[PDB]
Amino acid sequence: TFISRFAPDQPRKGADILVEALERQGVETVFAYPGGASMEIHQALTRSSSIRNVLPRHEQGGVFAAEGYARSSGKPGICIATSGPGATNLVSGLADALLDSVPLVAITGQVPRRMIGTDAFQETPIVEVTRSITKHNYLVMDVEDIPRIIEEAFFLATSGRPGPVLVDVPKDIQQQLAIPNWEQAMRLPGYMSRMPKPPEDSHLEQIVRLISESKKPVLYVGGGCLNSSDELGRFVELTGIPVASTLMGLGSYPCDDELSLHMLGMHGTVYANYAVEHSDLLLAFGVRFDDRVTGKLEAFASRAKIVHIDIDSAEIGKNKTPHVSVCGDVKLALQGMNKVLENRAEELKLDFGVWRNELNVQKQKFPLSFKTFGEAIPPQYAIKVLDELTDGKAIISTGVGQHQMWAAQFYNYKKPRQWLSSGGLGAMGFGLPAAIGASVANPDAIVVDIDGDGSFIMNVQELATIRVENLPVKVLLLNNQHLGMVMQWEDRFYKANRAHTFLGDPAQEDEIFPNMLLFAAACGIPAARVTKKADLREAIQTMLDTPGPYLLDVICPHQEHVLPMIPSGGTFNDVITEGDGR
C-alpha cells in the first residue's frame, strides 16, 4: 500500500529511512528548525512529497505548535530539532506534553556517536536531561534500529496514557547507508503486557447499580474523555446526571447544555464545586484528582462513593481512594455502561430531578459574573462576544493566567479539542504557537489565540511563522499591562505590594507598552486596538472577517480578579466570591 521512493534493495541514508519511517506512520506535518546536527534529516525531508514542514522561529515554538497540532486533532505532534541548544529548547514543551498527556514525538539530532560524552560541539546529554519529563526516550545507536525505534516511539506516544517520546539520532547514523526492514517487531513486552484489557461487565454493572442507588450523583469529567464525546453524551441522556469538568476536559460535554455544571476546582463555578461537595456518588472519568480541583483532599467529595475510571493504574488511588475503580479506556467503559442502561431502562427508571433542582437554584444564586466599569472593556465580556460571533465553534488556544481562566469560563465549547491550553505545567507563551499547530491541523477552522500581554510576548517571534505559512490565526490579546494572576495573588495575600508584575513602561505609566500592533506590522499581519466596550463587537467581527492572520489588541483594566476562588488546600467553605484590586 505505502509507496516508497527507494527500491526494496536500494541502500539509502538513515536520515531517509527516518523520514520514510514517519511517512509510514501517516505523518503529514512536522515542526522542524534546522541545525548542524540535523541537516541530513532536513535534506531528507525536502525529498518527501507527503510531509510538510512548518519552520518555527524558535524550537519552543516548534514543540508548542506540535502540541497544538496534537491537542486539536488527536494525532501525535511531531517536532524536530538539532543537537545541544536545539534540543534543550524543547524541554518546556516535553514537560508540558507529559503533564497534560499529549501524544508527541520529538526527534533531535545529536553529535556523531564517537563524539558522545566528549563535551563535543553543540552536545547535550538530552536523553539524560529529558528522562524525567518524557513518557520514554531513545538514543539510536545503529541505523538498523531506526524503523523499530520510530514505530515504538509512536506506539508509546499514542497508546495508553498519551505522552511525549524523544528520539535522539547521532549525525553519523543519519548519514549511514542501509536497507531498512519495516517488518521488525517492537520490543515492548513489558508495556504491551500491562496494557489495560476491555472493561468487565461485572465491574460496569456494579457502577450502574451505584447510580441507581444514589440520590446525588455527579460526573467529574477530565482530559481522559476527549475521545468519548458521543459515549459521554449518550451516558448522560440515559442517567440525567450533572456534568462537572476540569480545565482539561472542557468540551467533552457541551458547556451550554443545561445538565452542564461547567468547570470545577480553584476557579470553578460555585455550583460545580457545590455539586461535588454534597454528592453521594462521584463518577470520576478520565481525571487525575489534581490539587487544583480537589483543594484539601480530606474535604473533597467527603460524603460520597467515588468511582474512578483511568487508563493509568498508577493514577487510581494516588490521591483519593475510590469505592470502585476501573482501570481501562473510559470510552469503552461508557459504551458498556450505556448498553446496560438502555436495557435496564424501565427496570431502573432513573430520576435525579430533585438533585438537579437543588443545583439549579445554586446555579441561579451563584452564577459566573463580571462587573462593567464605564466604557472600559471587561475581558470576560470580550470572550463572551467572541463566543457569540463565532457561534462557539472556534478552536481556542491560550496563554496562562487570568485570561486563561476567563477563556475557560466565558466560552462555551461544543466539542473537545476546541480547547487548547497548558493545564498541568501552565507554560506561558503556549497560546500563539499552539494556535499555529491547530490551524495547520484544521485549515478550514476558526482558530483564535486568546492571549495575555505577558504570555503573548514570550513567543511573539512566531508571528513571523504565521505570516510566512499564511495561516488564518486570529489573536484576541487581552492586554492588561500586568502579569494578571501573580498580581491577583499580590492583592489577596500581599496587600497589593507589587513585585515585578508590571509589564509596561514606568517612565510612561499611562502608555500601552509595548505596542503589540507594531509587532504584527513587523510581520505583515493586519492589526487594530480597541479600548471602548462599545467598539468591541465591531472590532472582533472585523478580526474574524478579515481574511488571514489578524491581531486585535484589547485593552482591559488590570484590577480585574478571577472569581470565584478557592485558595490552595482550601475547602468549598473557603471559596471567595467577591473582590478585585480597586
Ligand X SMILES: Cc1cc2nc3c(=O)[nH]c(=O)nc-3n(C[C@H](O)[C@H](O)[C@H](O)COP(=O)(O)OP(=O)(O)OC[C@H]3O[C@@H](n4cnc5c(N)ncnc54)[C@H](O)[C@@H]3O)c2cc1C
Ligand Y SMILES: CCOC(=O)c1ccccc1S(=O)(=O)NC(=O)Nc1nc(Cl)cc(OC)n1
122 catalytic residue (yes or no): yes
Q: 3-state SS string over 292-357?
A: HHHCCHHHCCCCCEEEEEECCCCCCCCCCCCCEEEECCHHHHHHHHHHHHHHCHHHHCCCCHHHHH
Half-sphere exposure of 520 (CA within 13 A, CB side): 21
Q: Which of residues 430-459 bind Mg ion (CB under 5 A)?
A: 452-454
The residue with its CB nearest to Mg ion is: 452
Site residues (CB under 8 A) for a copy of itself, limited to 222-251: none
Q: Does the protein bind ligand Y through residue 83 (CB under 6 A)?
A: yes
Quote the least distance from Cβ 122 to ligand Y, whole Å.
4
The answer to the question of residue 115 lying near ligand Y (CB under 6 A) is yes
For residue 345 the three cell numbers come to: 431502562
Which cell numbers hold the place of 373?
A: 466599569
User: Which one of residues 4, 23, 24, 36 is an interface residue with ligand Y (CB under 6 A)?
Assistant: 36
DSSP state of 565: B
Q: Rule CB under 6 A: say whether 450 interacts with ligand X.
A: no
The count of chain residues that interact with ligand X, using the rule CB under 6 A, is 36
**373 contacts a copy of itself (rule: CB under 8 A):** no
Report how far apart, in Å, the C-alpha atoms of 437 and of each of 32, 54, 133, 396, 464 are.
12, 9, 22, 12, 14
Q: Is 485 a catalytic residue?
A: yes
Among residues 103 and 147, whose Cβ is nearest to ligand X?
Answer: 103
Q: How far is the CB of 478 from ligand Y (least distance, A)?
A: 17
CB 61 within 8 A of CB 387: no
Q: In the bound complex, what is the minimum distance in angstroms from residue 275's beta carbon to a copy of itself?
A: 19
Residue 417, annotated as binding a ligand: no
Q: What angle do CA 486, 492, 494 make, to 5 degrees?
A: 75
Residue 266 or 438 with smaller CB distance to ligand X: 266
Q: Choose, from 171, 216, 363, 474, the residue flagged as catalytic.
A: 171
Q: Are 255 and 418 in contact (CB under 8 A)?
A: no
Q: Assign 259 to helix, strand or coil.
A: coil
Name which position in 330, 337, 368, 563 contacts ligand X (CB under 6 A). 330
Closest CB to a copy of itself among residues 34, 392:
34
543 is catalytic: no
Among 90, 140, 210, 287, binds ligand X (CB under 6 A): 287
Check whether 423 is labelled as a binding-site residue. yes
**Amino acid symbol at 577:** T
**Any contact of residue 308 with ligand X (CB under 6 A)?**
no
**Residue with smaller CB distance to a copy of itself, 187 or 532:** 187
Question: What is the DSSP secondary structure assignment for residue 218, as one 8-state letter?
Answer: E
Q: Please report, as residue ranges, which positions from 2 to 31 form the binding site for a copy of itself (by CB under 8 A).
A: none
Residue bearing cell 482591559? 556
490 lies in the binding site for a copy of itself (CB under 8 A): yes
- Whether residue 24 is annotated as binding a ligand: the answer is no
520 neighbors 457 (Cβ within 8 angstroms): no
What are the distances in angstroms from CA 491 to CA 273, 487, 488, 496, 555? 24, 6, 5, 4, 21
Q: Which is nearer to ligand Y, 392 or 426 (CB)?
A: 426
Nearer to ligand X, 111 or 440 (CB): 111
Q: Which residues contact 563 (CB under 8 A, 6 or more apart)?
A: 267, 369, 576, 577, 578, 579
Residue 72 CA to residue 438 CA, distance in Å, equals 5
> Which does residue 71 touch among ligand Y, a copy of itself, ligand X, none (CB within 5 to 8 A, set by kind)?
none
Q: How far apart are CA 249 and CA 256, in angstroms?
A: 14
Report the residue from 1, 193, 364, 573 that binds a copy of itself according to the rule CB under 8 A. 193
Of 222 and 433, the one with the shorter C-beta distance to ligand X is: 222
364 lies in the site for a copy of itself, by CB under 8 A: no
36 binds a copy of itself (CB under 8 A): yes
- Which pairing describes strands 104-110 and 77-81: parallel, antiparallel, or unpaired? parallel
The interface mask with ligand X, positions 227-266, x = CB under 6 A, is -------------------xxxx-------------x-xx
Catalytic residue among 20, 31, 40, 59: 59
Q: Is 349 exposed, middle or buried (0-12, 13-18, 19+ CB in 10 A)?
A: exposed
The burial class, CB within 10 Å (0-12 / 13-18 / 19+), for 432 is buried
Euclidean distance between CA atoms 172 and 14, whole angstroms: 9
Applying CB under 8 A, which part among 161-169, 284-292, 383-391, 438-446 lies near a copy of itself? Answer: 284-292
The annotation places the binding site for (R)-imazaquin at: 135, 161
Binding interface with ligand X (CB under 6 A):
100-101, 121, 161, 222-224, 246-249, 263, 265-268, 286-288, 290, 292-293, 309-312, 315, 329-331, 400, 404, 423-424, 426, 485
Residues annotated as catalytic (active site), given as ranges: 59, 121-122, 171, 485
